[PDB]
Design a protein around this ligand. Structure first.
Ligand code: SF4
Ligand code: SF4
Ligand code: FCO
Ligand code: F3S
Ligand SMILES: [Mg+2]
Ligand SMILES: [Mg+2]
Ligand code: NI
Lengths: 544, 262
């Protein structure tokens, strides 16, 4: 059975570590299971306030600093939003370049999330010291493609490095880890812990390569600097040598995704099959990404190769089109002035008003985004269900592979296990498309190196920029007046997932997902971390 | 087992892009740094412990018998007694003040901790301040949004091995911030010949003409970007885009509008 204590009482986890930004989770636990939950975002910066009166061309540079983990994505959303507002259609080369940079970002972001943020909830690193490296190599040989990184010699080297570190008595980032001394919620054999730890270390090197690929096109990582109103600035990114280097680095990263990430994910999933019944939600939203036509937000929604859509009540038989007019944000349970509920983002208001820590009437700096009154999960699981439901052939193939390998029905994907698996699934699919996308741009660029369109700043206008960032549906909404920013509103995927209750007192996706969480050890509540981390929280993104 | 110097790393009002920049280091890579060179004893982004276990890790590091160095990422929000930025139920300004008291030295990673950064940009709703201003102590500033890992890891290794590097008037090590971006820019001969791109779509832009007319702040920005590159491959002007001035204090307000010189 799933380990579960008899604990009744409150648990607070602050800080939630291994996320971006500052999150406090409060839960009530009864008889070892979470019965109620609150997601409390603990920092406000106020980028929307800062943007007022500024030059719309400047927006992307400020909004990019909403977050440095999903770097790029806000510069892309702001550029799309100003493009819409000035009514410019970007050249084909700029659509391709912008989308490739997004692809590169998905690869970096997901790899770092699984290994460096999430894996320590499932992998007991100190237990890796008990493994037989000969047995580990044998196991690695059966569960993953042959590679020298998985040899007994390579795994013994990792184990010896780890042993020297632990023996030093300075445990650094592992100090007071929930797994020290063993923990009933940690299920893996030591051999699997060793394999995963070896890959965690390799991933530290691989993410450098992923960022370098991204920088060939983006100028630098973090915080790219190649987008402009009407397209991109990076003419060098259309040329032969840079693109050859981009392809070579992307192939190395993809090889790691296919050799290490997916096989580790499946191995971990196989031991934690009980997590297929914990942490589910019901409604999913995506704006889509990787569109063949980015001339308008309508065309983006319609032509996204990772498709857009809305699923309600787990009903994969009915994927609805996204109604942008139906999005609004509530503030009833947030640290903003009363009066601000039910605002569509073109009418959005950001009037901060703090009360006190743990006030059940106002407990978060995130707004509560809702869709005709319903909370919506966004991100890899949303995209996966939507794509699977629409019969997108890559998602159909990869999802069925995972379901087959785990021997679980698709309904088991509505869970924390599924949310974790979906992040891997879509990483494999981005990898599968990289070469096609690169060759397409290489050819388009050889043809005609037009990269930026002509445009004129209007006196008064409005516009929306949509994107599906690594964590989900992202939108930036601008009102221009007197050729300046009159309003600028971000509604960000972590706002959808990790925001507080809406005006009707209805829990957000993370708050719902946490209901029913078993707690084996209330002193070391790893199960809370498992579900929270599965959403890949980004609090700087969510609050801005 | 030779003791590795303790580093405590705090996150305040930040986007985490500084932490992300730091892990892009390749001389050495981040695993070698934290296994061999330093003992990274508190780091919210990557540490195993959470909640009170993490807060205890912080307090154990601050009370370590061999002392510790402090890295600070993010500015400090000071409105409402610091309550708009909290960790473990304490205002960020209170925790940073406590950590700074006993620190062997303080390194501010990024423009936000050095100078206040994006949240301090007008009209500064959270009353954000840079660390030196908030605490009333000298800091070693490694600015940029984010800084190059070369600059941050270089500074850290320098402090641990050689001493405190010579700083400029803004607290920046001259080792990395001694020269103007513009003085090392490959487009400098275009600048000298008045060969400027008038727009991003122009033939001049395609030929790689100077970006000064499109707002490039290279001539007033101290940083090593063209010399060292980012990610071993690129920098913004090489990617056809003007420099924003992101290593300069309060650049959000002094360097805007970004696409003009006015
Ligand atoms: S200096 Fe820039 S990259 Fe670093 S925390 Fe501040 S906004 Fe983020
Ligand atoms: S592009 Fe910028 S840094 Fe380079 S020469 Fe021109 S003004 Fe100077
Ligand atoms: N991905 C990502 Fe960051 C969040 N949440 C954005 O947009
Ligand atoms: S924008 Fe910043 S990263 Fe270098 S090129 Fe200019 S100082
Ligand atoms: Mg301990
Ligand atoms: Mg917002
Ligand atoms: Ni991010």
């Amino acid at each position: 059975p799933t380990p579960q204590s008899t604990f009744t009482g409150p648990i607070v986890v602050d800080p939630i570590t291994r996320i971006e930004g500052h999150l406090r989770i409060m839960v009530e636990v009864e008889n070892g299971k979470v019965k109620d939950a609150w997601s409390s975002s603990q920092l406000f910066r106020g980028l929307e306030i800062i943007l007022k009166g500024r030059d719309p061309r400047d927006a992307q540079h400020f909004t990019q600093r909403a977050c440095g983990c999903c770097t790029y994505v806000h510069a892309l959303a702001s550029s799309r939003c100003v493009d819409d507002a000035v009514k410019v259609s970007i050249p084909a080369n700029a659509r391709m370049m912008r989308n490739l940079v997004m692809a590169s970002q998905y690869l970096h972001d997901h790899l770092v999330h699984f290994y460096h943020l999430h894996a320590l909830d499932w992998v007991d690193v100190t237990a890796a010291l008990k493994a037989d490296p000969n047995k580990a190599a044998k196991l690695a040989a059966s569960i993953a493609p042959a590679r020298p990184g998985n040899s007994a010699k390579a795994l013994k080297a990792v184990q010896d490095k780890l042993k020297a570190f632990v023996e030093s008595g300075q445990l650094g980032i592992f100090t007071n880890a929930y797994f020290l001394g063993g923990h009933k919620a940690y299920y893996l054999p030591p051999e699997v812990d060793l394999i995963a730890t070896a890959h965690y270390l390799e991933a530290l090197h691989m993410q450098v390569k992923a960022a370098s690929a991204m920088a060939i096109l983006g100028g630098k990582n973090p915080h790219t600097q190649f987008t402009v109103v009407g397209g991109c600035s990076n003419y060098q990114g259309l040329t032969k040598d840079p693109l050859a280097n981009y392809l070579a680095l992307s192939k190395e990263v993809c090889q790691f995704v296919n050799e290490c990430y997916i096989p580790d994910l499946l191995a971990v999933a196989g031991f934690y099959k009980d997590w297929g019944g914990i942490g589910g939600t019901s409604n999913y939203l995506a704006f889509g990404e990787f569109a063949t036509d980015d001339s308008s937000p309508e065309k983006h929604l319609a032509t996204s190769q990772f498709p857009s859509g809305v699923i309600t009540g787990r009903d994969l038989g009915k994927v609805d089109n996204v109604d942008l007019g139906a999005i609004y944000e509530d503030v009833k349970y947030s640290w903003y002035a009363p009066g601000g509920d039910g605002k569509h983002p073109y009418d959005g208001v950001t009037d901060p008003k703090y009360t006190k820590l743990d006030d059940k009437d106002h407990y978060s700096w995130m707004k509560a985004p809702r869709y005709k009154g319903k909370a919506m999960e966004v991100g890899p699981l949303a995209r996966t269900f939507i794509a699977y439901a629409k019969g997108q052939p890559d998602f159909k193939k990869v999802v069925d592979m995972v379901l087959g390998k785990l021997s679980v029905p698709a309904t088991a994907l509505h869970s924390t296990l599924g949310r974790t698996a979906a992040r891997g699934i879509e990483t494999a699919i981005v990898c599968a498309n990289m070469e096609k996308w690169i060759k397409e741009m290489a050819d388009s660029g050889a043809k005609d190196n037009t990269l930026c369109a002509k445009w004129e700043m209007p006196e008064e206008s409005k516009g929306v920029g949509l994107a599906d960032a690594p964590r989900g549906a992202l939108s930036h909404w601008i009102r221009i007046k007197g050729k300046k920013i009159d309003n600028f509103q971000l509604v960000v995927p972590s706002t959808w997932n990790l925001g507080p209750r809406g005006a009707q007192g209805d829990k957000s996706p993370v708050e719902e997902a946490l209901i029913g969480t078993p707690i084996a050890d209330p002193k070391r509540p790893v199960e809370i971390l498992r579900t929270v981390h599965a959403f890949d929280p980004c609090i700087a993104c969510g609050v801005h | 087992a030779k003791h590795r110097p303790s580093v405590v790393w705090l996150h305040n009002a930040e986007c985490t892009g500084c932490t992300e920049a730091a892990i892009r280091t390749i001389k050495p890579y981040i695993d070698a740094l934290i296994l061999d060179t330093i003992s990274l004893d508190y780091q919210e982004t990557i540490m195993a412990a959470a909640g009170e276990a993490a807060e205890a890790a912080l307090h154990q590091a601050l009370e370590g018998k061999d002392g510790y160095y402090l890295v600070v990422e993010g500015g400090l929000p000071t409105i409402d007694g610091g309550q708009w930025g909290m960790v473990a139920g304490h205002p960020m300004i209170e925790t940073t003040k406590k950590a700074a008291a006993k620190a062997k030295g303080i390194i501010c990673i990024g423009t936000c901790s050095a100078y206040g950064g994006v949240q301090k940009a007008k009209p500064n709703p959270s009353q954000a301040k840079g660390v030196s201003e908030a605490l009333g102590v000298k800091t070693i500033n490694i600015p940029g949004c984010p800084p190059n890992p070369i600059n941050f890891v270089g500074a850290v290794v320098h402090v641990l091995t050689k001493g405190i590097p010579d700083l400029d008037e803004n607290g920046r090590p001259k080792l990395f911030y001694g020269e103007l971006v513009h003085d090392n820019c490959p487009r400098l001969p275009h600048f000298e010949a008045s060969e400027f791109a008038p727009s991003f779509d122009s033939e001049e832009a395609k030929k790689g003409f100077c970006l000064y007319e499109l707002g490039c702040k290279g001539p007033v920005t101290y940083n090593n970007c063209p010399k060292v590159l980012f990610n071993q491959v690129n920098w913004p002007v090489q990617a056809g885009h003007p420099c924003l001035g992101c290593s300069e204090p309060d650049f959000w307000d002094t360097m805007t509008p970004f696409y003009e010189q006015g």
